[PDB]
Amino acid sequence: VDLEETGRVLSIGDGIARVHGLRNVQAEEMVEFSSGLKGMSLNLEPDNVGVVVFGNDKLIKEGDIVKRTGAIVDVPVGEELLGRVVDALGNAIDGKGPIGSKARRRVGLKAPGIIPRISVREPMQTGIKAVDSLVPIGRGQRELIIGDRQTGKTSIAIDTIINQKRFNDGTDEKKKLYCIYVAIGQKRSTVAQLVKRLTDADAMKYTIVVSATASDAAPLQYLAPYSGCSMGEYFRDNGKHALIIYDDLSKQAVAYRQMSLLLRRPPGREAYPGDVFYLHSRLLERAAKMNDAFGGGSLTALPVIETQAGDVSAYIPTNVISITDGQIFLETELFYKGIRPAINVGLSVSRVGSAAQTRAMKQVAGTMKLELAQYREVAAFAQFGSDLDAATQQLLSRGVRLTELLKQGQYSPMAIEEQVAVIYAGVRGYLDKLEPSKITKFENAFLSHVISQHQALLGKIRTDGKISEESDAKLKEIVTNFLAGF
Amino acid sequence: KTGTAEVSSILEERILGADTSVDLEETGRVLSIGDGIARVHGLRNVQAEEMVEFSSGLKGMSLNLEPDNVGVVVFGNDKLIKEGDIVKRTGAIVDVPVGEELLGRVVDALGNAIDGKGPIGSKARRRVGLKAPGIIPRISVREPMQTGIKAVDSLVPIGRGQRELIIGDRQTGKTSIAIDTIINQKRFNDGTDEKKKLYCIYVAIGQKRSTVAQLVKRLTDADAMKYTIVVSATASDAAPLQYLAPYSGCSMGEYFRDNGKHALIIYDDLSKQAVAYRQMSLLLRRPPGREAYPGDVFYLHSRLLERAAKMNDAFGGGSLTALPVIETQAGDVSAYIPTNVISITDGQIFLETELFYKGIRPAINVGLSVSRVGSAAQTRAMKQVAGTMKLELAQYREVAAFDAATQQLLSRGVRLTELLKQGQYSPMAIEEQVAVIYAGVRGYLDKLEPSKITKFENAFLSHVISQHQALLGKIRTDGKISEESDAKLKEIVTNFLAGFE
C-alpha cells in the first residue's frame, strides 16, 4: 500500500476526495487520481487529505488509489497566448488550440513587495469617455467594477479593450502592454460571442484568453485567480505592462465557499470564509506595477463586482472597498433613463491616483469634474427647472451639455485626445449654444471634422502631450468651424 | 454515530450470545426510550413508515431507522414510558375507520371522539398513503361550490372541487370565514342534490378544548355538522397527530369524493403542521432549515395540496375539495408557509384585516384574492353581473381617494362597495346576492345615500322577497339570463327602493 505519495479513496461523495495514503505527499498539489484525475488536495486530515475533484470525477469509483503525483498548480507563461483562446487546464478556450505556449509556472508566485512595485504612470486606454476623463487606470492599477445583470460592465470593458487593442495591435513604446481579461461564470453563448468579437474587434490579436465558464470547475474557478496572477506575472516580470480582469469575482467566492462547505470548513458570514480576504486579496494586492527591478512591467487588474440589488454591504464588497484603489459605480437607472453610459459619478471613485493622468486630460478633467459636481450640487433644482438662477442655469447647461455628452457607445472606443478636445471646447463655452438633444451629434460631427482636418492638429497635441496655447487655439478654431458650421 | 447498544444492554447478551431470542421483525425492546423519539431493539424487518404498537398500547410511527433502532413517534403523552420498552410494531401504514357515519360524528383522525358521541362509526379503515390523481382520472372541473357571501361567490366563484387559500392572519375572521362558508355550505348540503348535499370536512388546527366546544355548538346549531366532518386538534394535539390530520382529511376525501362525493375539506393551518413536523425533526435532530423548518415541506404538503382533484367521471364524479385559509405573519408573503403556499397555490384568497382594522367585517383583501378558477363555477347570471362588477369595484378602488361625472362614478362605486358588505355570521343563498347585483348594475339606489342605502339594501332584499320570492326561485332554477325575471326585478326594484325614500 501507499502512504507517502499515493492515496486510496477512503470515503467520498460529490467529489469529496479523502483518500487513504500519500500522507507524506506535499501540500497543495494537483495530483492524478487512480482515474488519472490530476487534482489538488488541501484538507490534509490526520488520516487523509481532502482532495478537490478538479472537475467532475464520474470516472472515479470509490476506493480508487490516487497517486499523489506531488505536482503543484503550474500554468503557462509568455505572450504566446496573446490573441489565442486557451483554457487554464492547458486546453484551448474557443478550441483555439496550442497557443504555442509551452511552459507551466508553478503556483509559487507571490505578489511584489514595495520595492518590487513600480510607480504607475500609464494613462489607460479606456475607450469610454468619462472612464479616461474622471480617472483612467495607472500602470498596474486596481479599480473595482460595480455592476448588475447585463450591466454593460463587459461593455465598458469592450470600450477599454478597443482603446487598448489598437496599441495591442500597435506598438507605442510606452503603450506596449499585455492583455488578459476573465469572462468568469460565462455562458457558452457569451464566451462564443467574446471570442468572435475579439476576432472581430481584432482583440484576438494581442490578448491572452481568460474566462471561467458556467460549467467551469469550482476548483478551476478558484485557481483562475492564481491562473491570471501567474499569467500576468509572465509579461510583468517580462517587463511588459500587463492587465488582469477578475470578471467576475463573486462566482469564485461562492465556489470556494461550496468547496470548504463540503470540506465542512467553517462557513463564515454568508458562508463566505476569510479567504475572501486571504485567498482573494492574495491575488488582489498584487494589482501594481512590477518594478524596473521586477521587470518594469505593470500588473493591471480589472475585477468585476456584481451589485446584487446593490448589495453594498457584501462581505465581498466589504473586502473590496477596504481593498479598492478604485471602484466603478454605475447609475444603471440612467441607462434605464436612456443615459447609457449610466455613470454613478458622485458615486464613482478611484484611489489609484493621478500619476498616470495626462496633464492635458488632467487639465480638462479639473474643470469638467468640478462643473459636474456643481451641476450635481443643485441638480435636484433642475426638476422644477423654472426660475433657474442665471449662475445656476449656466451651471446646469454646462451640466446639461455634459449630460448630452454623458452617453457612451458600445464597442466604440475613441481617441482620448478627442475627448480632451471636446471637453476643452466646452471649457471654451463653445458648446453653450448647442441644443443638448442635438449637441451630441454636434460634438460627434465636430469630431469628424477634426479627425479629417485637425487630425493634423490632433496628432500635434497627441505626440505633443503639451497644450500649446497656439495649438490649443488651432484646435479651438477647427472646432469653431466644425460647430458654427454644424 | 453513538453506538446505541454499545453498552452491555444488548452487548452483554451479544458477547454472551444471549440476545438471539429477540423478536426482530415487528417487536423487541426499545433501542432508545427517549423524548418519544423511539428506537426499537430489532424489528428491522418492519415495514418503513409502518405502524408500531408499544406493549403499553401506545402507537409508534417509525419513520427514521437505524439498522434495527429507529425513529418512531410516541402517539401520546408518554410520561410513563420505560427503558427497553416493547413496541409490537403493527407494521402497517397508518389507517383509520372512514365513512359518512363520521359525517355527523366528531372523532379524531384515528377515529377517536372527544365529545362523547361514541366510538368511530365510520365504516372502513383507510391508509392515508394516497398519491396524485391520474391524467385519465383527472379532467377540468367547473361546477359551483357553496360560497354564500356576496363578494365571495361574486369575484372568487366557488368551484365544486376548487382548492381555496384564504389569506387572513391572527384574529382575521378566518374562523369566521370558515363559519360563513359552512352556513353557505349548509343550505347546499341542506339540499336534495346529493352533489349539493355535502357530507364534507372542515377543521381548525389548534382548536383548543374551549375552541372545540364553541365550534361544536356552532356547527350543531348549523345542523350542517350532521352532513359534516369536524375534528378539532386541541392544545395537546400531537405533532404526529396534527401532522397527519391533513393526511386524515386526504384519506377521508379519497373515501367519499373518490366515491363521487361532491365534498369539501377545510383544514388549517399547515403552518402549525410545519411547527409540529419541525418539533418532530428537532426531536429527530433532523437537519433544519428556514425557521429551522424543513425545505421538503414542499412535497410533504404537496401530498395533500398538489393532489387537488375534483372527482371527475373516473373518480366518481363528485369533488375532493379543499378550502385553505392563509394567515399572514406581518403580511410576510415570503414566510415559509406563506412563500410556500405562494410557491404552491394556483389560486388563493386574501382578506384585508386592515379593512377589518379599518373596521370592515367582512373585509376581504380586494384584488389580493386570486380566482384563476374564474366565474366558470358561478351563475352565468352572476357571471354576467360580475363582468360589470369587476370594473365597477375597480374604479371605486381605482380613484377611491377623491370629474364630477367621475365623481358620480366614484359615489356609485363606493355606495356599491358599501352595499356588498355583509354582517356577522350571515351567510345565505346567492339569490338575494344576485338581486342586489341587479340593483347595483341598475344602480337601483346609487342615488340613495350609502347611509340611506345602509337600510335601503335590507329593505330592498325584503320587498323583493315579499315581491318576487317566486321569481327568485324562478331565476334560481333557470339560472340563465332571465329577461322576464329581469323586468320583474326592475318593477320590484322600483317598489323596494322607490317606495323606500
Added chain:
Amino acid sequence: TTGRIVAVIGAVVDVQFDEGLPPILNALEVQGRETRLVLEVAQHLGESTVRTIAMDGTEGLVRGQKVLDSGAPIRIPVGPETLGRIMNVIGEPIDERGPIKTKQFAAIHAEAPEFVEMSVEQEILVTGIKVVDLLAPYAKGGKIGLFGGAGVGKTVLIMELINNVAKAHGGYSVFAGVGERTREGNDLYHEMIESGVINLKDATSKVALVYGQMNEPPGARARVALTGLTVAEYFRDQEGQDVLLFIDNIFRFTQAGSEVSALLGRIPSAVGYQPTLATDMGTMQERITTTKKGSITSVQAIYVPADDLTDPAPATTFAHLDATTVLSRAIAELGIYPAVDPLDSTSRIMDPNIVGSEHYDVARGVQKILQDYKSLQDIIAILGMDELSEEDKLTVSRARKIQRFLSQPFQVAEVFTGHLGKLVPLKETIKGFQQILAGEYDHLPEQAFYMVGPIEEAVAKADKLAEEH
C-alpha cells in the same frame, strides 16, 4: 451486486450491496418494493452501501430489502418517435397508453456543449409579441429566462405564447410540467388534445409532453433536469427537429435539490440550497442548445417565488439567462396584462446593430421616457399636474399612452381577458412606436391603446369610445 436495505430515514439510504459502490450517476431499482423503485447511487461513502438518491416513497420497506443494482442513470428511448404520448423520465408513459417506445435510448449523465463545436450566432426568433417585440425581441435557441412569479401570469402568458408559437414549432417540440399542478396536468392534456401541435390520438405531435408535478416528490421532481437536457439533445440530433422546449417550474426544482441536500447533509446555501446546487443548475443550463448538430429553442421559466427579485435563486437565474423576461407584477397589480418589468429585462435583439438603430434607439428612448414617468410620478405626488410643465404634462400623457399601448388581451386570455388576441406585426409595432413618439393620439384617450394590438386599431377603439361617450 445487489443493495439491501440497511438503515435510513427514508430515501437517504445506503443499501447493503455485496460488492462495492457502482460508478457515478448509478441509478438502481429497488427489488422488493411496491413499484419499480429506481434509486440513484449518490454518496461514494463506500461500505458496500452507498447513500443513494431514492426517488420513490420508502414506506413499507423492511431493513434487509435486497434491491436490484443497475449501475448507471435511467435509460429510456428518445427522439421524435416517443412524441405523442406523455412519458416519465424513467420512460414511464403516464398518458395511460403504456410504453410509448422510441428508438434513441441512453443514460442521462453527460457533458455540455464543446468549447469549439456549438453554434456561435444569434437569430431573432421573432413571434410578434407586443411587449417582447416592442422592446426585448428574443433570439434563436438561447437561454431565455421567464422572470415571473406564481399565479403571476407565467402560466397565463405561457398559454398565450403557446397558442401563439407552439402551434407552429420549427420542428417537433417539448413541454415539461416540472412541478405543475396535477389539475393543470389534466387541463393541459385536454388543451393539447384541443391544440393540435401535439395531438393525443393523431400523429400531429410537433410537441412532447412531460410532467414533473408538485405532487410528484422532488426525488423525481428534482431529477427531471437531466431528462430535459437529454430530450433537448435528442431534438438537437435524435428528435433532430427545430424545437422550443417548455419546462416549468424550476424554482421548486432547484429548491428541490436544496431540500435533498439536507438528507445529503449537504451545506445549506444562502437560501439553504446545496452549495453545489448552483454548480448543477449552471451546468444544467449548459447541456443542450443551438450547436453544429445541436439546437434547442428552449423556453426557460424564471420563477421568482415570494416576488424576491434579488433571490439567490434569482441570482443563479440571471447568472446564465442569455435572455431576460422581467415581469413587473406591480404593473399587473396596476392592471397590466402584459405586465413586464420594462426597463429591466435584457435581450440582445434590442440593439442598433441588431434591432436596427431605429428600433433599438426607439426602445431606449421609451425606457428613458418611462423612467421620467416614474420620476415625475412622485414629483407630482408632491405637487401634482397643477405644476405640470409643457414638456412634463406632455411627457405624462405620452408615458401613460406608452404603458397603455404596451398591453394586449389575448384570445386564450379572452377566456378571462375577453378581448381576443391581436397578432402584433413588428413593423406595426415600430410604426406605433414612432407615431407615439410623434403623439398619434394627442387629442385622443390613451385608454384605447390599453390592452390593444396595432396603434391604428387603438385609434379605431378611441373612435368607438367617441361613439360610446
Added chain:
Amino acid sequence: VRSSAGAVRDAGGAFGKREQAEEERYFRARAKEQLAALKKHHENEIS
C-alpha cells in the same frame, strides 16, 4: 445607497396612493378634454 426616480412612488405609500389618485384626477381631466375634443371632431366630420 441610491434614491430611485419615483422612489416614493416606487414605494407607493400613502404618498404613492396620493400619486395614483392625483394621476386619476388630472389624467381624468385631460381624458374628458380629449374625449370632448374627439366628440367635436366627430361632429366636424359629420358634415
Added chain:
Amino acid sequence: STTSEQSARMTAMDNASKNASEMIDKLTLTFNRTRQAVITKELIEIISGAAAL
C-alpha cells in the same frame, strides 16, 4: 397676499423639511437597527445550521 403666499409656502416647506429630517432620524436609527438585525439574524441561522451539522 401673494408675497404672504410665497413666504408661507417657503416656511411651510421649511417646517416640512424639519419634520422630514426628524422622521428620517428615527427612520435611519431603526434602519441600521434592522439592518444589523437581519444580518446577525441570518448569521445566527447559519450558526445553528452549522450546529445542526
